[PDB]
Structure formats: C-alpha cells, structure tokens
RNA sequence: GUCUACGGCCAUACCACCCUGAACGCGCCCGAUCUCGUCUGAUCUCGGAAGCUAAGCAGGGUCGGGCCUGGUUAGUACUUGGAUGGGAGACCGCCUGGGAAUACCGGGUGCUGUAGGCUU
RNA sequence: GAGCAGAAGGGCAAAAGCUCGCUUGAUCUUGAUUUUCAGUACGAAUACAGACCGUGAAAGCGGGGCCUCACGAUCCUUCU
C-alpha cells in the first residue's frame, strides 16, 4: 500500500518534475485526459461549467482520476453517452518521494537512522492556486442542472474546499457566451474543431480575401 | 560546502545578454582610460583574458595605472569585518565609464560658470541642490464640471 | 506538408543579426580589431592606417584614424584623378596603383609642412627602402597598410600602393616577400623585374606579344590604348612623366558646384493615411469585384 | 517582341559546370585505373575524394578511397557534354531535374562515348550531373560583398527545358 | 535629392516576394601574356572596357512575418515594514510604501561622422 | 540546433570550429596583483617590464591548452 494524503496534501518542497535529474519515477494513475464525445465542435455544446479550488494545495493522480470516473458516471446516465465532454486540466508533475523501510534490523544495510535521507520517488501530485480550474465540463443549455450535479459528486475525491461555477465563456473558449454568436457571423472567430480561432485584422489580405469569399 | 572555484555562480552574470552575442562593439575598445577616473567593473564573457573576479561584477573604483591592454584599479572589497582597497588588473572590455562622476564634473564647470558671472547682473543664485521642498498653495479649479463620484464594486467571481 | 520549416516565426525572434558592414560584406571585424586600436598607455594618439581599396576601375587610397564616431580621413588620394597629368588612360593596374601611393604619399606630407625632407627615393629603384627618421627634424609618418578583404598574395596591387606609399617619404614597416620581384621556391628577390612592373613594361610587352597573336583581337582588347595613340612603346617615359608632376604639384583642388536642383529621383515614403484606404478600396473592389455572378 | 526582347544583353541560360564522378568501393587498381580513363575523355588530372565516416555493411572503413571526380568548365564543358546526350539518345526523364534546375544522367559503360578500351582500363561506369548557370550568379561564391543572386534571376526546373530543348532538343515524356 | 571609400550605434537596419532606378559610382562582365592560385582563370590573382541594369546594390511597396516603442493586461501577480488581525490549519484580509510579465490593441521601420563624386 | 580531449556551465561563425603552411612564448628573468585567505602559504591565474625568439606583408598575437579543476612544505637525496 501508499501512504494516506494526509502526508502530502501541502506545497513545501519546491517543484520536482521528472527530468535528467529525477529517474525512475512510478507512472501516474491518471492517463486520459479529455473524455466523452472529444469531436463536438462549437454549436453542440455552449455551455461550460468549471470546478475551482479555494485552497494553495496538491492533489495527486490518484485522486485525479477518481474523481474522473465517478463525474464521467453520473453524466453517461444522466444525457447518453456522448451528451457531454469532460476534461480534466491538470496534470500530475511534481513528484512526491517516501522515505526508505527500515526492516531488519540496523545492520544490513548502511543506514538504521536518518542518515542518507534523500528519499526515492514513490508518487505524482498535481499543485493548485486559488484561483485555478480543476475540472470543466461542455455540454447543451438544458443540462445545467447535471453539470452542477456531476461535479458535486466529483468534489468529494479531492481533500480540499472547491466551488461548482458555470462560465460565461462559450464552451472551452476564451470569448463570452454572448458576444460569441456574433462575433462567428462578423467571421472574427473561425471553428475547428473542440477550440475556434481567432482571425485578426492585421495579417496580409490574401488571407482575408479567402476567408471573405 | 561548496567549492572555491573562480567561476562558480558565474551562470548568468558572465553571459552575454539576449540577441548581443558574438563580436564585441569595437568602440568600447578605444573609450580613453586616464588615471583618477571613476570606472564601473560589470565584465563579459566573450573575453576570458584579464577577467575580473566575481566579487568585483558590478563594484566601482577609480583609475590608478593603465597599461597596453587593460587597466588598474582601486576597488572597495566588503570583507566580513573591514572595508580594504584592492588593487585589481582589468582588460578594458570588462569596465566602463561612470556617469555618476560625469553628472558631477559638469555641474561643478556649471556651478563655477553661474558664480563667475552672477556678479555683473548682481543676483546670487542658488548653487545646492535642495531635496524636494512640499508644494506650495494653488487653486484646482473644476472648469465646470462635477467631480465624479467613484463608487465600490461589487464582487463577480471570473477567474 | 513536407519540412519542418527551418525558417519559422521563432527563426527570427532569436536570429541575431552581424554587424551592418559585415553583413553587406565589406568589413573584417576580426582584423579591425587588431589593426585600429591604439595601446591604452599612449592615451590619446592617432594610430593611423593606409587603407587601400581596388574597384574593378578605380583605384581608392587613403589613410584614417578612427574615434568613437567614425574613422577620420586626414587625406585621400584616387586613381579617376590621373588625367590631370601625363597618363590618360590605363587605370586600376599596378602602374597606376604606384601612382597613387605616390600621390597620396606627396598629398599628405606637404599638408604638415614635410615635403622638402623625406623625399622617400626620386629614382626608381625597386629594392627594399625604409625611411628611416632625420634627426634635428621633425618624424617620419608611422604608418600601417590596412589590406581589407583582399588576399595578400606576391604580386598583389595592393603592395604598389605600399611601394608608392614608402618611395613617396612614408615610413611604413614592410618585407619583400609579397612584392612582384620575389622568387617564392628560391628565396630570392630579384628587385629588376618588380621595376618593369613599377613602369609597366609587363604591359607593354604584352601590347608586343599580341601583335604577331592576332590583329583584331589585340584592338578589342586595348581599345582605348589605340585611343590617344598609345603605341607599346613609350610606355616606360609614359609613367615617368606622370612621376614628375606628383612632386611638382600634388595639392588637390576641387571644382565647387551649386548650381543644381532637389529633384527626386526616389518615391517618398507612403505615409500612414495613403496605407489605409488602400487597402480599404482593395476591398471595395473586391466585395463589389464579385457581386456579379 | 518588344517584351520579347529585354533579356538579350544579360539573360542567357548557359552551362557553368560539368561534375564528373566514378564511384567505386576498393581503394587500389579499382581507383587509379578508374582514374585512368579521366585524363583523355576531359584531358584534365582528376582530383580524389575519401570517405568521411565508416558503414561497415558492405565493407568500407573511414578515410579510404572511395571516388574520383572532374569539374569541366568553359568552351571544353559543351563537347563532353554532347557525348553524354547522344549516348543517353537525347532521351532523359522529368525527374533527372533538380528544384534549381539542374540535371544528371548516368552512364552504364564508359566506352560509348568514349575513346578506346585500353590494355588495363576498366570497363566502368560515370555519370555526368550539369551545374546550369546565368551571367550573374557568381555574386554567390567571391569574396568581398557576396550575396544572395535574386529570386527571378534563380533558374526554375521548367525553364531549364527552355535551354534544353532549343540548344540540344532532346526530348522527355516518361515523365514517371 | 543622393552615391562610392571608410566607419560608429549593431534588425526601426533582418527575412520573404514584387515595382522602379536619370547622371556618377559600385557591379555584372571580356580575357589568361606576365603576377599568382587551382581537378577546373568558377572563386583567388592579373590585363582590360564590347555589353547591359537581368542580378547584387539603392529607393518604394505589402490590411506581410520579425524587431523597436506604446497602451491594455493592472494597481493585477508579487513584495518592504506593521498588528494580542482572521482561520483548526492551508493560507487570506487590512495598514504603510514600491510595483511587474504574455495574450489582446496601436504606431514606427534605420540614423549618422570624416573624405571625395554626380544631380544646371 | 555541430565542433572546441574530458564533468557541467559560460564563450565562439571571413571565429575559439575544420583543413593546410611555418614553427617552439610549454624558453630565460626581477617584482606587483588577483583567487582561498588570517588578507599566510601551496596550487592556479591576471596585468607589466628586461632579454631572446616564433609568426604574419603588416597591425599585431604568443611567455602552454577558449575560461572555470587536473596536485604537494621542512629535513634528506639527486641533477643543473
Ligand atoms: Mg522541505
Ligand atoms: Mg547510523
Ligand atoms: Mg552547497
Ligand atoms: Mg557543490
Ligand atoms: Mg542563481
Ligand atoms: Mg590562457
Ligand atoms: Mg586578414
Ligand atoms: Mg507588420
Ligand atoms: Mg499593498
Ligand atoms: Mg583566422
Ligand atoms: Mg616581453
Ligand atoms: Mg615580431
Ligand atoms: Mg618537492
Ligand atoms: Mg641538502
């Protein structure tokens, strides 16, 4: 077994990535990222709901995934399952390390005390702010409801204090709800796909000429 | 315990800054060093020959003796106890002129130029320079118009 | 959908530029450094340099001293102003480049009141003559030879300026090995056959070796030198002639010139009110362009 | 024709060089008799090259002798050139061109064109490759104020046809 | 209005393609006897002047890319000093001072010294 | 984004890389200075000066390695 996260729920040791320096780490827990109907371009899915921490904390990639499955759960039964789209923005890069396991019996071997201390890799935690995003989920106007729901339910796999908060931007954008449906008629913004870009009015003519056409 | 090395913590403060690579501008090699004049030590990486030493980056001394292809000075070294005045050898690349002296010897030409001739138009100016008196009485005046009144506001959470 | 294009937008927000006369070609930073700047214990004197340039019809010498703000021309001498004098035709060769250094030598020396010392040597003799200082008289001009991007090969027209330079009074540290008289397998330097090239009798010869080779040919070739009636003779006394009235005469004077328009012979920059509705009736025939169908 | 006239003084597709190569695997009597056959189909001395770093699966190490090579210039570079045309029967494909305009062509035997098989020379194999120039491109190799040669004065691979099929008309189409 | 030779600051100067360039000059260019270098007079060197601005180069262009300078981001993030302030803690407010950076939106796009040319 | 003998960092493009030509400045000397520091030494390093040379047409550059490590008192022995 691990140890409780009660032994590393806070950031005081100076973040740690894998790296040339750091070998051998375990694999993280949490391998997909994004979940549900991945291809939904822009009009399918105008809402979007987030997950906000209210704690300087680290969560890790157990629980990152946990709480992964059981917000993909309610919404399958909740709009079929290719109502939503689920993706997780965090990513497990600190790593956490554990002390060695004294066993028998402080001959064998070099060590029977804190002497040469400097722990072996054991673990992936993922460090959040305050104001920080945990998990967002895009789905129609008429599934508010359950995006609250869903998420309230994934609040519980985590340690700290979270907040359940619809977006006023469009989807996954960065535009507001509002502005977006004339802003894609005035063709400042262009969809592809899960994201949409944004065509500025400064870049050489040819480009404007085929979008215009 | 670290070790005594020249160039340990050297990382950054020896490179050449971003895009200023390569070739050294050839003017800084014909800036004219006299003795007694106040240089400011910073050092670049580019010329490894007569380099300072990493205590000196930064630091400032004057001019005691200038030879073919770098230059003498008297710079104040901050050890633990006591301030003591080494005497260091520094090719040319790796200092350049203080314009805090040279802010300072063209007032004292301008100081003495203004008191040399305050005497046939019979004012005395003022020479010190005074640190910043409180500002004196004036009217604001509104030009007709309301001061607008600033108000809190409420709280939205957004990010 | 081929290459990872090497020159992408991060290609340039990190592509440092070289220095402006070295990307367009002309500077050797490398040897500037060496050859312009002055030892700092002398604090102020000019260390000056003989910078000798050949065009493909011009032959440029001068000599500058540099500071802060750019080099200082103290003279300058040029090939386009032999025709007032002797030789009329026949530019940017080693004869001509002898000429110049003579010129330039002669010019520089009677503007600090030297021309009646350190006449360098009046008879043409192509051995190894340094000017060595008068005592009880004022120095010899120190100077130093700045070659550029030409390679210093033996026979190079650089070095008949040099030669001009230092047979003109101007003390300037040399060696025989880059000279048109030395026998590179030998050692030797054979300091007659550098005089035929002092005079140009390499190209007289050469006016004597395309008489019997072709006739039309030969008159396609030195086509100016049937202009002034340049026989391949008479070529020797041509540059001795030319040798004279340096000496004589080397003060330059210039004809002044006022009397001149400001016409543009450029476009003026378009300015920012012109760039904008532009491209606005760029699009005004292009939205009205296909409203046709 | 008064636009058809404006390159006549300084646009004139002309060959610069000649590139000749014979590869071979075996430094000794492979090589010196490989470059036997060079000194009278050119009349030149050819100029070696060695390998630069070892493969070792087919039995080659670094710094041997592997191939030879000729850079034929000049009023000399047409007439070797038109021996490699005819022997090739005017008959090259699209993709012997290059993105720059250049061509090559091997040859299976070096006794077509040719000259006569001696009492020890081999019975080799070379190939030409033509460097096809313009009045002005030698800006690009000098060295004081060098530079890029522009990019209309640049030789395109459809245009090196319109020196190849006018001054040699040779014929393609196999493209593939 | 500008160009050569030499520079200083080293992109407002770079890069991509397009259009024009009067006279000077810079070049392309024409040769290989000498000088001197090669596998090759292509570079390098040399002696030249039939031909052209096609290229280099110079100037302008582009809802150009970069680069430079502004805003905006934002009094935000961070922070000096202070409290018997809050909170179980994590950490967050306040007081006293300083105060950023990207995306996003504008504008700009080489100056200049010495010496000598042309431009009526 | 290569290379520069090696660890890593810094530096470097008509260069410090590569390939060639010519060579011993990896020589003989007295001091001053910096680094560790008690402002002691060793080790290493930086400017000079006096010789004597090397190299290049020359300006110059060079008294070991592009910079940061690669090493050792008294007594004693040995050689000049
Ligand atoms: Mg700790
Ligand atoms: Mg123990
Ligand atoms: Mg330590
Ligand atoms: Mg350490
Ligand atoms: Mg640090
Ligand atoms: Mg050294
Ligand atoms: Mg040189
Ligand atoms: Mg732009
Ligand atoms: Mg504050
Ligand atoms: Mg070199
Ligand atoms: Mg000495
Ligand atoms: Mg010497
Ligand atoms: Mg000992
Ligand atoms: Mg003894």
Known sequence: GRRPARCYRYCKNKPYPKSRFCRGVPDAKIRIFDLGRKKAKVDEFPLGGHMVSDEYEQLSSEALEAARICANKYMVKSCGRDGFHMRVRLHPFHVIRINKMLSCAGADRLQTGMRGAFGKPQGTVARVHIGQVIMSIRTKLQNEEHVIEALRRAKFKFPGRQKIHISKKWGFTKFNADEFEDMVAKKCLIPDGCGVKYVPSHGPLDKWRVLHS | ?159 | GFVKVVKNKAYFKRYQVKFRRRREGKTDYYARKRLVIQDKNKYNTPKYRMIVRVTNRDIICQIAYARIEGDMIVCAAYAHELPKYGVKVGLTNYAAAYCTGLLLARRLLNRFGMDKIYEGQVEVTGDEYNVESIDGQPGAFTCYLDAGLARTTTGNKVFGALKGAVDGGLSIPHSTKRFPGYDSESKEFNAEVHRKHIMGQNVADYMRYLMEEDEDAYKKQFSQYIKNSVTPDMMEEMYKKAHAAIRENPVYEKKPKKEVKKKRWNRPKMSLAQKKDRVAQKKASFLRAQERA | QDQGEKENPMRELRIRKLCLNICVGESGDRLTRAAKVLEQLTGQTPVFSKARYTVRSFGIRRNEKIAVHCTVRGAKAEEILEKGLKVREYELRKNNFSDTGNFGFGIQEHIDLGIKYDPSIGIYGLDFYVVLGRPGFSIADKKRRTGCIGAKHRISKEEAMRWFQQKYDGIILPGK
């Open chain 2, 1 to 159: 315990t670290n070790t005594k090395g020249k160039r340990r913590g050297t990382r950054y403060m020896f490179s050449r800054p971003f895009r200023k690579h390569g070739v050294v501008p050839l003017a800084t090699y014909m800036r004219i060093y006299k003795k007694g004049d106040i240089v400011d030590i910073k050092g670049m990486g580019t010329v490894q020959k007569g380099m300072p030493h990493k205590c000196y980056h930064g630091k400032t001394g004057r001019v005691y003796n200038v030879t073919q292809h770098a230059v003498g000075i008297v710079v104040n070294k901050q050890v633990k106890g006591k301030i003591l005045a080494k005497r260091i050898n520094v090719r040319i690349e790796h200092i350049k002129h203080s314009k805090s002296r040279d802010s300072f010897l063209k007032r004292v030409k301008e100081n003495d130029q203004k008191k040399k001739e305050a005497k046939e138009k019979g004012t005395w100016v003022q020479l010190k320079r005074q640190p910043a008196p409180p500002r004196e009485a004036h009217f604001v005046r509104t030009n007709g118009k309301e001061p607008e009144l600033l108000e809190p506001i409420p709280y939205e959470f957004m990010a």
